Amino acid sequence: EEEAVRLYIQWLKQGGPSSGRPPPS
Numbered sequence: 001e002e003e004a005v006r007l008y009i010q011w012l013k014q015g016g017p018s019s020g021r022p023p024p025s
Contacts, residue, residue, distance in 0.1 A: 002009040008024045017023055 011021050011024055014021055
């Protein structure tokens with residue numbers, strides 16, 4: 001699934017944009 005975005009999803013999994021984290025989108 002997460003490959004190239006595994007490093008983004010890690011953010012989105014970090015707690016999500018919800019957490020206040022900046023999307024490495």
